[PDB]
Amino acid sequence: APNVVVTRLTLVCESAPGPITMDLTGDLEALKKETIVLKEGSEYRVKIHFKVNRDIVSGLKYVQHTYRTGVKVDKATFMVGSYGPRPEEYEFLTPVEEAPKGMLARGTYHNKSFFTDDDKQDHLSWEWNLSIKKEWT
Numbered sequence: 442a443p444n445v446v447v448t449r450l451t452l453v454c455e456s457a458p459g460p461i462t463m464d465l466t467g468d469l470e471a472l473k474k475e476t477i478v479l480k481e482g483s484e485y486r487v488k489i490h491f492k493v494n495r496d497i498v499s500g501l502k503y504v505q506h507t508y509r510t511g512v513k514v515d516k517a518t519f520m521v522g523s524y525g526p527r528p529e530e531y532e533f534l535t536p537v538e539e540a541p542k543g544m545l546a547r548g549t550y551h552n553k554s555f556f557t558d559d560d561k562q563d564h565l566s567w568e569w570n571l572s573i574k575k576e577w578t
């Protein structure tokens with residue numbers, strides 16, 4: 442296995458009625474037709490789970506590009522940093538953001554995520570969709 446293995450994305454939202462997560466260890470192609478759901482206006486964090494198997498790694502970064510119809514791409518880069526090898530997964534969390542709000546803000550956002558580093562290595566790249574709704578259901 443590679444030294445760095447990205448295993449999971451979770452949306453951390455205390456107001457959500459259940460877990461919001463995606464296993465990143467398998468068929469990433471299937472994520473493109475799927476979606477995860479946030480109630481409009483919800484406060485959330487993106488949490489990336491990853492393993493460091495053998496060697497200290499440095500310069501890790503999480504890059505997230507969000508696409509919404511009629512809008513230019515919303516690009517955000519988050520410094521993840523340096524991690525040593527250990528059996529248990531690490532979790533990196535972004536700062537809190539607020540999900541969009543408004544009937545016209547609802548619906549699909551297409552995300553492209555990169556777990557990478559200062560040397561531009563592709564630890565994992567994946568697409569996933571977010572659906573913003575008036576209510577959780």
Ligand SMILES: N[C@H](c1ccc(-c2ccccc2)cc1)c1cccs1
Pocket residue numbers: 452479485487507508509512513514515540541550552571
């Ligand atoms: N600002 C919005 C935006 C909407 C949703 C998210 C998002 C991403 C991942 C998880 C939860 C929410 C980020 C930004 C825009 C995106 C593109 C054009 S406008």
